[PDB]
């Protein structure tokens, strides 16, 4: 069975759920970059509308309704930046202690958090506080994560040849304003802080520019946008905040290359938590003597010690072959299995609605890795798959949340499952078309449908774990 009060949940993110029935939210670049024409004919984005989405802004009583009647405790919920402050926060100065190009202090008082109070919408701040209450007043688990991906206008236009939504040097800065601002009027509610939602997606898709040395240039600017935010809004909260980040199960073609494996997991992921955990930014560094771009301390202290948990993501696996002086994801196997099938994977597995191989052991894998490098308390942010049918979901829940066991077991400070997702949702560039959801919605009518597999979800929350009558869908390989 599975540790006491285990935490079994649901993730949610502002851009794919809120909108739908009211109060549309067009102030985003995600908005507008799912609405350009260009975007939708030369195959970007799916063409479907946000704002006729799932209406979680309006409906999320009756879906956490849902989510209490199988046995849900927990819930992660997004903020989003653009409905806090619709209008710049530029004209609210603060402190900004820099060097070489490291920002190593954002000075956030309180004179900031009455400057920003003028300026934020104050009516967002009570929806989002009502949703808050909603699930922290049936005992559940709150997890706020500030930034998914979408971002206010003012911060970032794609109108005036990718999304652009990186961080710079401005963006920090109002990002720090505004997750001090988050953490002080919800600093004791959420009972866990997420400063962003998958960052390396972000940093790795914002920009046309896919060499490695611009690649970690921008996740630079994510690390101190964390480190910095940390800092801020540690002085109103006493809870642990971390990152949630996207994972895979790194693995070398047929395990031949393991230095390759390494070399894919630091470049993409423990250069990140390696800064803000001890600040290690050598990488950081030894990108930018290539790019003639000004470089600081090779160990910095104001990033260091700025993670208090771990949201991991997982999928399925990421298979990795060395090109020249680089790496591939192999297609037909893991994330890039829906190119050679759409049924089965190389190694004969089955795959998603979106091309994700299942891998549950994976799972096991993933959070190995991460507890054998840091050992901080952790939690499974996503894990899902795009099945409409609920074809593969039922065996994909069970599986994964053994061999997620099978990782406490070994000593993985993981003390919560927060499946993506509760309902289906728009699957950014995709749509609707891939549906997550333990629960099926239907646009047209905003109908909830409960899914088969959200019944065994239901099961294993009444036993926290796995009766030996659910074993068989367990198996690992299907």
């Known amino acids: 069975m599975f540790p006491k009060n285990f935490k079994f949940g649901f993730s949610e993110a502002g851009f794919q759920f809120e909108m739908g029935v009211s109060d549309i939210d067009t102030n985003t670049d995600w908005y507008k970059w799912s609405h350009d024409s260009e975007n939708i004919k030369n195959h970007i984005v799916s063409g479907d509308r946000p704002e006729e989405g799932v209406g979680y802004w309006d409906l999320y009583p009756k879906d956490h309704d849902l989510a209490e009647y199988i046995g849900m405790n927990a819930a992660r919920i997004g903020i989003e930046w653009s409905r806090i402050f619709p209008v710049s926060t530029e004209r609210v100065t603060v402190e900004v202690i820099e060097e070489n190009g490291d920002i190593l202090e954002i000075k956030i008082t309180e004179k900031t958090i009455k400057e920003l109070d003028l300026l934020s919408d104050k009516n967002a701040m009570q929806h989002y506080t009502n949703i808050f209450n909603d699930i922290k007043k049936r005992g559940w688990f709150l997890v706020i994560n500030l930034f998914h991906w979408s971002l206010p206008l003012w911060i970032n236009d794609p109108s005036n040849n990718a999304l652009g939504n990186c961080m710079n040097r401005s963006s920090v800065i109002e990002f720090v304003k505004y997750a001090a601002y988050i953490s002080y009027y ?96 050598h990488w950081y560094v030894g990108a930018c003597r290539k790019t003639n771009h000004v470089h600081g301390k090779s160990i910095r202290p104001d990033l260091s010690n700025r993670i208090d948990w771990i949201g991991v993501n997982y999928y399925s696996r990421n298979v990795v072959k060395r090109k020249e002086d680089g790496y591939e994801n ?127 979800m239901k099961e294993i929350t009444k036993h926290n774990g796995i009766p030996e009558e659910l074993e068989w869908l367990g198996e690992d390989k299907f």
């Open 186 to 281: 919800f600093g004791s509610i959420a009972d866990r802080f997420a400063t962003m939602n998958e960052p390396n997606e972000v940093f790795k898709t914002c920009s046309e520019d896919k060499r490695v040395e611009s690649y970690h240039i921008r996740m630079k600017w994510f690390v101190e946008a964390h480190a910095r935010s940390y800092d801020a809004m540690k002085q109103f909260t006493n809870r642990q905040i971390g990152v949630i980040y996207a994972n895979g199960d790194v693995q070398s073609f047929e395990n031949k290359d393991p230095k390759l494996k390494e070399e894919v997991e630091y470049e993409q992921r423990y250069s990140f938590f390696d800064a803000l955990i001890h600040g290690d930014v």
């Open 330 to 456: 192999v297609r037909g196997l893991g994330y890039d299995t829906g190119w050679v099938s759409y049924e089965k994977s190389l190694d004969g597995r089955s795959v998603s609605e979106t091309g994700w191989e299942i891998y549950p052991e994976g799972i096991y894998n993933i959070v190995m890795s991460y507890h054998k490098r840091y050992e901080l308390p952790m939690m499974i942010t996503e894990n899902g798959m795009a099945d409409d049918n609920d074809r593969f979901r039922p065996r994909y829940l069970v599986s994964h949340l053994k061999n997620l066991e099978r990782a406490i077991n070994d000593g993985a400070k993981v003390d919560g499952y927060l499946h993506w997702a509760l309902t289906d949702n728009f699957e950014w560039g995709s749509g609707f078309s891939k549906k997550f959801g333990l629960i099926k919605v239907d646009y047209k009518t905003k109908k909830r449908y409960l899914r088969p597999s959200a019944l065994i």
